[PDB]
Write an enzyme that holds these catalytic residues in place. Structure first.
Site, PDB file in Angstrom:
ATOM      1  N   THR A  43       0.842  -1.185   0.000  1.00  0.00           N
ATOM      2  CA  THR A  43       0.000   0.000   0.000  1.00  0.00           C
ATOM      3  C   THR A  43       0.874   1.231   0.000  1.00  0.00           C
ATOM      4  O   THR A  43       2.072   1.163   0.293  1.00  0.00           O
ATOM      5  CB  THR A  43      -0.827   0.062   1.272  1.00  0.00           C
ATOM      6  OG1 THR A  43       0.071   0.211   2.378  1.00  0.00           O
ATOM      7  CG2 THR A  43      -1.712  -1.168   1.443  1.00  0.00           C
ATOM      8  N   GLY A  45       1.076   3.824   2.215  1.00  0.00           N
ATOM      9  CA  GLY A  45       1.675   4.046   3.516  1.00  0.00           C
ATOM     10  C   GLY A  45       2.670   2.992   3.959  1.00  0.00           C
ATOM     11  O   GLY A  45       3.728   3.296   4.468  1.00  0.00           O
ATOM     12  N   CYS A  46       2.339   1.727   3.744  1.00  0.00           N
ATOM     13  CA  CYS A  46       3.170   0.643   4.220  1.00  0.00           C
ATOM     14  C   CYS A  46       4.443   0.486   3.376  1.00  0.00           C
ATOM     15  O   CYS A  46       5.514   0.084   3.841  1.00  0.00           O
ATOM     16  CB  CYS A  46       2.398  -0.671   4.331  1.00  0.00           C
ATOM     17  SG  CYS A  46       1.082  -0.623   5.509  1.00  0.00           S
ATOM     18  N   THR A  47       4.307   0.798   2.087  1.00  0.00           N
ATOM     19  CA  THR A  47       5.479   0.915   1.207  1.00  0.00           C
ATOM     20  C   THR A  47       6.410   2.038   1.650  1.00  0.00           C
ATOM     21  O   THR A  47       7.618   1.815   1.745  1.00  0.00           O
ATOM     22  CB  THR A  47       5.099   1.163  -0.256  1.00  0.00           C
ATOM     23  OG1 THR A  47       4.264   0.096  -0.682  1.00  0.00           O
ATOM     24  CG2 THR A  47       6.345   1.223  -1.148  1.00  0.00           C
TER      25      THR A  47
END
Ligand code: NA
Ligand code: NA
Length: 156
Positions: A43, A45-47
């Protein structure tokens, strides 16, 4: 000096990693360990969070620390995520949420008229003797890896 006590069994849980191997928290004895939990592979944010940690990995090495990212996505998903982003640290496929529950990062939100569980972005700093010495919960990505690195330097 521990901010969280984990079930003793947590340290022997077999953790499936990207790349097809397994580790346990006990196997990291002797150095600092950053464990960062994130809700979902690949995603925005998670990236960003993973790339932020990846960019600082030489500074984490300078303290001999190691990083583990954790979500409940599959090993295959983690392999794809790591390959596409170039991560040089492993991702735990915590598919049964055993590690997530141990660290109490599965949180409930009353939404859509029902109780919905999910991983709350959270990070922990584990000493060389396996003590959880600092915790960050409901993490906003921006500035987080920098703050974790600073706290590591302060503890180490
Ligand atoms: Na597993
Ligand atoms: Na450790």
């Amino acid at each position: 000096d521990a901010v969280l006590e984990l079930p003793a069994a947590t340290f022997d849980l077999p953790l499936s990693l990207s790349g097809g191997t397994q580790t346990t928290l006990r196997a990291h004895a002797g150095h600092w360990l950053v464990i960062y939990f994130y809700p979902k592979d690949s995603t925005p944010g998670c990236t960003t969070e993973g790339l932020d940690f990846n960019a600082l990995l030489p500074e984490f090495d300078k303290a001999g620390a190691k990083i583990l990212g954790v979500s409940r996505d599959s090993v295959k998903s983690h392999d794809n995520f790591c390959a596409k982003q170039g991560f040089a640290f492993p991702l735990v496929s915590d598919g049964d949420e055993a590690l997530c529950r141990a660290f109490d990062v599965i949180k409930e939100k009353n939404m859509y008229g029902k109780q919905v569980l999910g991983i709350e972005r959270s990070t922990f700093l584990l000493s060389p003797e396996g003590q959880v010495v600092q915790a960050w919960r409901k993490v906003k990505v921006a500035g987080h890896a920098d703050a974790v690195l600073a706290a590591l330097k302060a503890h180490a």
